Amino acid sequence: LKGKRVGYWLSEKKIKKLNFQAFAELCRKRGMEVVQLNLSRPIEEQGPLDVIIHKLTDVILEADQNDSQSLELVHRFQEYIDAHPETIVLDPLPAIRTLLDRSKSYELIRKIEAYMEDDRICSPPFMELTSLCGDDTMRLLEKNGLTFPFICKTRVAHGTNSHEMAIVFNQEGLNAIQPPCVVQNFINHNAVLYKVFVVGESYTVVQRPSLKNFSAGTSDRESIFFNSHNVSKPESSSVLTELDKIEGVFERPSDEVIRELSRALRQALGVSLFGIDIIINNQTGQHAVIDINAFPGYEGVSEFFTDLLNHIATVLQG
Ligand SMILES: Nc1ncnc2c1ncn2C1CCCC1
Numbered sequence: 001l002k003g004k005r006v007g008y009w010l011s012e013k014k015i016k017k018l019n020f021q022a023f024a025e026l027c028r029k030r031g032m033e034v035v036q037l038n039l040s041r042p043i044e045e046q047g048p049l050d051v052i053i054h055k056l057t058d059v060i061l062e063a064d065q066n067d068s069q070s071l072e073l074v075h076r077f078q079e080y081i082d083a084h085p086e087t088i089v090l091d092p093l094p095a096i097r098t099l100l101d102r103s104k105s106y107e108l109i110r111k112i113e114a115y116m117e118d119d120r121i122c123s124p125p126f127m128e129l130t131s132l133c134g135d136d137t138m139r140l141l142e143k144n145g146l147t148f149p150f151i152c153k154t155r156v157a158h159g160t161n162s163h164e165m166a167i168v169f170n171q172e173g174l175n176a177i178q179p180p181c182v183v184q185n186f187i188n189h190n191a192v193l194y195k196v197f198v199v200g201e202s203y204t205v206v207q208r209p210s211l212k213n214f215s216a217g218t219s220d221r222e223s224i225f226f227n228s229h230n231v232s233k234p235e236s237s238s239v240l241t242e243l244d245k246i247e248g249v250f251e252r253p254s255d256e257v258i259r260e261l262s263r264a265l266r267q268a269l270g271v272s273l274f275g276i277d278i279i280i281n282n283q284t285g286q287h288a289v290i291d292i293n294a295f296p297g298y299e300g301v302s303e304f305f306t307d308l309l310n311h312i313a314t315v316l317q318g
């Protein structure tokens with residue numbers, strides 16, 4: 001492992017929160033060379049590279065919106081990868097584009113559920129709402145299987161305000177929707193969120209606070225705006241987190257379901273650094289995947305730096 005050379009492009013915001021500069025010094029003591037890539041230079045000038053770990057989703061977004069600077073950056077990384085199929089990429093770019101779009105990620109999940117054909121997994125119905133359409137909006141939502149209450153989220157799952165959401169309970173509360181957005185059926189789950197952090201083959205299930213239970217169907221409740229990251233941070237104390245009482249099924253996630261679901265995501269995308277947000281439907285007992293996260297923060301995850309080396313050492317053994 002000594003002499004192996006790894007490069008990385010991360011946002012100093014990913015970097016700081018992962019404490020990535022400390023992890024780079026961790027690897028240099030193991031015998032590695034860890035280089036912070038300059039995407040001003042051609043990347044061949046910084047080679048050779050055995051592993052490239054990155055999260056360029058925010059360059060990827062700009063490049064799709066015809067930003068000259070960002071398409072230039074994406075080009076040079078892609079043409080470096082074609083000229084170097086030996087360099088390991090964590091993670092491939094087609095997986096980045098999929099996970100930054102909530103509509104694409106939610107559709108990917110529903111297809112993987114049909115793949116496993118296991119009655120323990122389910123996805124809440126969803127649809128992309130590019131615009132509201134008058135006094136009759138719900139009939140458009142009813143044809144995609146959506147009922148009150150549902151959650152409005154941003155349709156791009158990265159950047160500022162991408163965690164700002166709103167839960168709508170009745171016809172009066174449709175003005176809370178701000179399109180274009182993604183709407184998703186709200187699932188009662190006894191205010192427990194199981195965040196599954198995946199680093200290659202090893203994974204960690206972290207239990208987090210979540211939204212409390214509400215009445216199924218239509219309620220006389222005003223729409224509630226919240227921040228999903230703030231609500232489910234390793235500890236929030238919110239009016240939305242305080243559960244009233246246990247209602248319906250309250251079981252703990254099946255370890256077999258998490259493992260088989262993690263494999264199906266790594267096979268479908270080639271992704272190896274990601275997180276799965278899972279809630280337990282208190283109303284059928286099924287595992288409900290509500291969001292996918294590309295290379296997340298791994299906030300306070302036990303033994304993350306150790307699992308990250310073992311992953312980097314694992315991919316280099318092939
Ligand atoms: N469909 C859904 N049902 C319930 N909760 C959901 C959800 N989608 C996202 N969440 C978040 C969990 C943490 C806070 C809100």
